Design a protein around this nucleic acid. Structure first.
Ligand code: MG
Ligand code: MG
Ligand code: MG
Ligand code: MG
Ligand code: MG
Ligand code: MG
Ligand code: MG
Ligand code: MG
Ligand code: MG
Ligand code: MG
Ligand code: MG
Lengths: 143, 168, 106, 206, 63, 65, 141, 145, 70
RNA sequence: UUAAUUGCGAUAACGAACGAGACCUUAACCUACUAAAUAGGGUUGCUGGCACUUGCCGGUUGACUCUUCUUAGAGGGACUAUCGGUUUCAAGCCGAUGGAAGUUUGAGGCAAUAACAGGUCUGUGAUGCCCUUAGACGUUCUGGGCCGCACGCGCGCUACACUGACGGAGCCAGCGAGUACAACCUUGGCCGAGAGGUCUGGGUAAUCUUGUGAAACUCCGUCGUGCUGGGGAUAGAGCAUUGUAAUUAUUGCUCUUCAACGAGGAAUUCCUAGUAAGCGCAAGUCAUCAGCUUGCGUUGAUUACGUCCCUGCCCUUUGUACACACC
């Protein structure tokens, strides 16, 4: 046999990663938690509020696993969306700049993210271990 | 220069289209038709088709050497890289613009407008056209405007066989 | 004595296709006579230039439009060949209209 | 029977509901015979398909709309209104839940209730406006027979959307109830009442 | 409700002042060989079947 | 709305006139037979000619016309 | 060296390239397996070609796909058409033709295109309107 | 998370800051009901109280209400960045401040007066009862205040 | 307002007595018995899947159907 | 019959041209060619992690090779093809089979005769003649003004929510476009809740921006049908950015304000398939502004596949004190 990351669906993975981060509690805090919009178009901050950021960095981690060299802006642009701009139509604008940077900076210290050449960030050795274990753990919950 | 490929080729087309309209206005007396601008390395062959070729040349480098320097001062070039050659037209009747400037002159000079058209049509049929037309408009006598139409043979208006065949 | 291969790329960009394709055929046929290692006539995507414009001057009557566009045919013929053989293939194989051009620097 | 080991592991529940029987999404597609000519060879359960979604070049010839599955026509009619125009994915989800409601509702195959609903809600005779000098006299004309199918399909989902507007009762909960009321000929639903309204309008103009 | 189950033999052209109606001759299923030309609202093909309340009442071309 | 044009029907009438032989019922043969003889500029037009020639051959089997 | 085919698949403008191989039975897409896809309701539409023919054909045949262009439900249909051809191209190449006919017979009876490359490309949104056919809104009041 | 066990029935309204805090519902959306609070500010305030947003909070503890009210009164003392405010930058050289109740509607009426005193192109248009921010009312809105 | 939003212990007890032996179980069908509002019913549906008692059929956000434990 | 004066056919007409068609451009098919480290894959090197057997995912322009996808040349391919009825067993139409394509294959591009007192003298050193021609109606600066509002219509956008809203999470496009004499697109890194700064690059462009990981969508939660968390208008204050200059908010962002409006009367617009409808992108104008627009791709139905009932047009016969032609 052979265990892998993808066999676990992304919804259940990020939840299992979030719970994994809550068990440690050493992912770190940015300093703007629940005094923050998250997306520059978004009338209400995160509803889960407390926690939340652990689901966020898990999401950035699995995106950086899947892709070659993802930076800040590409995350912003990915995680952005539709402004309820008014009686005018919608537009796309990239999500909050700093928060995603604080997600990345925190993931660098833990050892999930590694700095890549050319432009952006890639994955560490010890980051890949936790990804695979969390994948193995969620597969056991399904069985 | 260097500019982008897509901006150079549009600036070349403009440059040509400027030159084209200059030589329409400047070489009216000479009976000019069209330019064929070739752009090789170092030299660029700006060929100019016209009826009265001896008038375009002048007296062995005179009018062409005025115009070469004019093209250089418009578009920043140096002497040597631009070279003018005034050639004859292979059958003048087939080219529409040549006939246009002849009809232009015949009206300007003083001639019967109807017969001016009929004479130029007969010339075009003699040269070797499957068909032809002349529309002349405005006020050919009287105050109120008219069009007047003088033609011969098969005239295709529609389809692509138009850009290929009919010189307008 | 030299045999110093600089790796030269040839640029062929133009509007007309039947000239361009004939020009591109002429260079590879010269490469076959001079017998060089070369990548074939590579064909890059055609940048179509779309000037949208209302047909009218006055902006009155019905609202009609003309997409006045320009075809462009960007091609490449990469040579693994010396400087002197490139100087030959620049001198010959020159047609009107098509923009022959050399990069020369790998 | 016989769960074959593929490298990309498939769940045990999915591997069972495969191969041996030509099922629907999870449960079987068989049975659901109409026993009422006109609607046979148009309300086609005879064509077995596993999901209520196709590309389906049915809108081209003329009678290719008949060969389309009845479940897709329900997702298709559920797409009405500009808020929900396009978006089959949502409608397929809604069609999934209506059938799950009917499976819970007194057992029974849910496609039977879907088809039994369409049969009752199809009008027999419908009036069309004739000129006839000037006044608005309406001759009773016979309906035939995709038009009965097509009008019933809309009539059903109109009963759903009318109930759905300003309501807890989810479009699937409404539609399933409309199908249930149309299966057990009750005349409480919008599809049956509107069938009855025209019928009535057919008898008056004869 | 006494229903008469009817069946098509020939579509007798598209009729009516408006386009959405059709004259069609009908050989009904039970008790065959009693042909009646009755109108039709929707799309039709030969061998189709018609559900209707009122059968024996022949219709004409609508003005 | 597939009614073949005049030139199609005019040529194909003049084609079968001059070449009843060299026209085997089926299309692809008659198609290649058309491009041999008559000097068509188009592809579609040539294919459409061949299309009528065939319909003339298939009538020819069921008596004259 | 091993017996392999590179079976493409297409819808609107989506493009899936299903490589097929010999082995245990991988059916992967961009690295991730068959089981995900992740429009979720149309998981079963990419299971359709597998269940029709049977899981037994995948004990030998090992598929792997890479999808580009289009949207979600298109790329599903791109994958889906890359899969159905994947088997037929393998059964045409390295297995009997009677099986490949039995595949095509099963595909044609339950034909939601699958083997047939889909025809429909978008009409240009020509002027005097919002879309292609859809005109503006004249007024004479 | 948990359905309301125990006797319950702990007051339907609930008055706060001379205004009606609606019973049941939620803190955030009972706060919006107060004249001067919105959705994003009230969600900011609920964080400092450490009450669940899932809870209905018409059955609140009295000490929790006193925290909330103090958070409304004082921005700078508590952890509020101080440009998340209703008013900011006002009087001569000093501090930002805001209100969220009867204090705010009075402050707005005082700022409306301040605009009327200065007689600005905004303030002149407030006197008319018309369109301040250069919006065209050639066609739109033929009823008005 | 049409009421049926107020939370009580008397209403808590009636929901538990009105739980077992019920074909349809969803957010709509609880509210159709003039019960606690949409989400309060939705929360009440969540408690009825704590330790069996009512088992699930669908799992969707708003389309959350359940049925009694047979 | 045809979409077509498109053809059969009957025939003082016969054979012709124009227009239609053909043509052209584009969008559809090629495991059949020619091609690629600016397009993508396979083995293998080094190398990251796993289960720990051989196996799985990778990351590297380390090698070697391939052209399915990709481009894009050159070709072909569809002809209503084959079969069936149906029709003077004609022109053709209708249904099955295969076939990428069976709606003129889809869409446009050009588009005749004759004109119209249509519109343009505000695109024009295109222009006749009346205007003017230094207190210029020339030019040029400087401030305004076109945007004002009792009120009429006309395109548009946002909504009147539970097929929802709001959070997260998942996360897939295509047309494009873009600076070296300027100041363009602007990744990557830090600062900032934002907007936006800054350093640095890459890119004159299948190479960098850019997989423009766009939106609507899909999943799990919060509210449940109350002018409610629907709906965002009006407002106040600040924080940004363009420009010499922003008040008559340029735009963006911040928090606050929470108005009208529970699907709209008489009327009438648009539409027959990858269309309508939704959704966003995109260039155009642009220093700065998108509710606009010409393009683009995503989601993708309903209902005909007819008829002359209305509307318009066209012929034809008929009438006509009309021919500046029903004003
Ligand atoms: Mg909105
Ligand atoms: Mg012609
Ligand atoms: Mg044409
Ligand atoms: Mg066409
Ligand atoms: Mg005029
Ligand atoms: Mg003038
Ligand atoms: Mg104006
Ligand atoms: Mg318009
Ligand atoms: Mg790009
Ligand atoms: Mg409100
Ligand atoms: Mg008209």
């Amino acid at each position: 046999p052979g265990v892998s990351v993808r066999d676990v669906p992304a919804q259940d993975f990020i939840n299992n990663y979030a719970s994994f981060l809550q068990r440690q509690g050493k992912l770190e805090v940015p300093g703007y938690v629940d005094i923050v919009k998250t997306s520059a178009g978004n009338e209400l901050p995160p509803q889960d509020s407390e926690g939340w950021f652990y689901k966020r960095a898990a999401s950035v981690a699995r995106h950086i696993y899947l892709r070659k060299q993802v930076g800040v802006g590409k995350l912003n642009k990915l995680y952005g969306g539709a402004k309820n701009r008014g009686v005018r139509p919608h537009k796309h604008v990239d999500a909050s700049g700093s928060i995603n940077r604080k997600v990345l900076q925190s993931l660098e210290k833990l050892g999930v993210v590694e700095i890549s050449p050319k432009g952006g960030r890639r994955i560490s050795d010890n980051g890949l271990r936790d990804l695979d274990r969390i994948a193995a753990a969620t597969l056991e919950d399904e069985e | 220069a260097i500019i982008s490929k897509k901006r150079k080729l549009v600036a070349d087309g403009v440059f040509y289209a400027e030159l084209n309209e200059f030589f329409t206005r400047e070489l009216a007396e000479e009976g000019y038709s069209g330019v064929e601008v070739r752009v090789t390395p170092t030299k660029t062959e700006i060929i100019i088709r016209a009826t009265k070729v001896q008038d375009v040349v002048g007296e062995n480098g005179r009018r062409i050497n005025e115009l070469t320097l004019l093209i250089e001062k418009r578009f920043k070039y140096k002497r040597g890289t631009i070279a003018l050659y005034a050639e004859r037209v292979h059958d003048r009747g087939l080219s529409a613009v040549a006939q246009a400037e002849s009809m232009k002159f015949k009206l300007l000079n003083g001639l019967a407008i109807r017969r001016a058209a009929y004479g130029v049509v007969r010339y075009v049929m003699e040269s070797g056209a499957k068909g032809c037309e002349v529309v002349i408009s405005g006020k050919l006598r009287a105050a109120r405007a008219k069009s007047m139409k003088f033609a011969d043979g098969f005239l295709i208006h529609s389809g692509q066989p138009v850009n290929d065949f009919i010189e307008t | 004595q030299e045999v110093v291969i600089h790796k030269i790329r040839i640029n062929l960009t133009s509007t007309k296709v039947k000239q361009l394709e004939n020009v591109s055929a002429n260079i590879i046929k010269n490469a076959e006579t001079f017998k060089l290692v070369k990548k074939g006539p590579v064909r890059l995507p055609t940048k179509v230039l779309k000037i949208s414009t209302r047909k009218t001057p006055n902006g009155e009557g019905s609202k009609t439009w003309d997409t006045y566009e320009m075809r462009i045919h960007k091609r490449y013929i990469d040579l693994e060949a010396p400087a002197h053989i490139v100087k030959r293939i620049t001198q010959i194989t020159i047609e009107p209209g098509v923009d022959v051009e050399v990069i020369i620097a790998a | 029977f016989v769960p074959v080991e593929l490298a990309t592991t498939i769940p045990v529940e999915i591997q069972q509901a495969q191969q041996e029987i030509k099922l629907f999404n999870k449960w079987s597609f068989e049975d659901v015979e109409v026993k009422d000519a006109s609607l046979v060879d148009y309300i086609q359960i005879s064509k077995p398909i596993y999901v209520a979604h196709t590309a389906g070049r049915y809108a081209n010839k003329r009678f290719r709309k008949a060969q389309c599955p009845i479940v897709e026509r329900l997702t298709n009619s559920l797409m009405m209104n500009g808020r929900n125009n396009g978006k089959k994915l949502k409608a397929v989800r809604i069609v999934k839940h209506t059938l799950e409601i009917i499976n819970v509702l007194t057992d029974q195959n849910p496609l039977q209730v879907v088809v039994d609903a369409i049969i009752n809600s199809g009008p027999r005779e419908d009036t069309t406006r004739v000129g006839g000098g000037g006044a608005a006299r309406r001759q009773a004309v016979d309906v035939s027979p995709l038009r009965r199918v097509n009008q019933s399909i809309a009539l059903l989902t109109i009963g759903a959307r009318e109930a759905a507007f300003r309501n807890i009762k989810t479009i699937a909960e409404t539609l399933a109830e409309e199908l249930i009321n149309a299966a057990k000929g009750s005349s409480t639903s919008y599809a049956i009442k509107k069938k009855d309204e025209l019928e009535r309008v057919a008898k008056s103009n004869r | 409700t006494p229903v008469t189950l009817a069946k098509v033999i020939k579509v007798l052209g598209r009729t009516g002042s408006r386009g959405g109606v059709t004259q069609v001759r009908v050989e009904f299923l039970e008790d065959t060989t009693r042909t009646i030309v009755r109108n039709v609202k929707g799309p039709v093909r030969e061998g189709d079947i018609l559900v209707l309340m009122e059968s024996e009442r022949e219709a004409r071309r609508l003005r | 709305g597939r009614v073949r044009t005049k030139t199609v029907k005019r040529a194909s009438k003049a084609l079968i006139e001059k070449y009843y032989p060299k026209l085997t019922m089926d299309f692809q043969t008659n198609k290649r037979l058309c491009d041999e003889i008559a000097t068509i500029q188009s592809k579609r037009l040539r294919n459409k000619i061949a299309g009528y020639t065939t319909h003339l051959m298939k009538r020819i089997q069921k008596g004259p016309v | 060296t091993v017996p392999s085919v590179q079976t493409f698949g297409k819808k609107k403008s989506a493009t899936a390239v299903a490589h097929v191989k010999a082995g245990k039975g991988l059916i992967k897409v961009n690295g991730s397996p068959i089981t995900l896809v992740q429009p979720e309701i149309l998981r079963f539409k990419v299971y359709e070609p597998l269940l029709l023919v049977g899981l037994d054909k995948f004990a030998n045949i090992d598929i792997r796909v890479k999808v580009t262009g289009g949207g979600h439900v298109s790329q599903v249909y791109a994958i889906r058409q890359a899969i159905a051809k994947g088997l037929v191209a393998y059964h045409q190449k390295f297995v009997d033709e009677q099986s490949k006919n039995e595949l095509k017979k099963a595909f044609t009876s339950y034909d939601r295109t699958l083997l047939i490359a889909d025809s429909r490309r978008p009409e240009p949104k020509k002027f005097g309107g919002r879309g292609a056919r859809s005109r503006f809104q004249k007024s004479y009041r | 998370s948990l359905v309301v066990q125990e006797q319950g029935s702990f007051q339907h309204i609930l008055r706060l800051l001379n205004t009606n805090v609606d019973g049941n519902i939620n803190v955030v959306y009972a706060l919006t009901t107060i004249r001067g609070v919105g959705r994003r500010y009230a969600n900011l305030v609920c964080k400092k109280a450490d009450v669940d947003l899932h809870k209905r909070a018409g059955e609140l503890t009295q000490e929790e209400l006193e925290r909330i009210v103090q958070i409304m009164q004082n921005p700078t003392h508590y952890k509020i960045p101080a440009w998340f405010l209703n008013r900011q930058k006002d009087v001569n050289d000093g501090k930002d401040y805001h209100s969220l109740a009867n204090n705010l509607e009075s402050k707005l009426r005082d700022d409306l007066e301040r605009l009327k005193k200065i007689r600005s192109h905004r303030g002149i248009r407030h006197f008319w009862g018309l369109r301040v921010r250069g919006q065209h009312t050639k066609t739109t809105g033929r009823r008005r205040a | 307002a049409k009421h049926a939003v107020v939370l009580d212990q008397d209403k808590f007890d009636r929901i538990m007595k009105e739980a077992p032996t019920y074909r349809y179980v969803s957010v709509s069908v609880l509210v159709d018995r003039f019960k606690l509002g949409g989400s309060l019913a939705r929360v009440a549906l969540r408690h009825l899947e704590n330790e069996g008692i009512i088992k699930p059929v669908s799992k969707h956000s708003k389309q959350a159907i359940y049925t009694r434990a047979t």
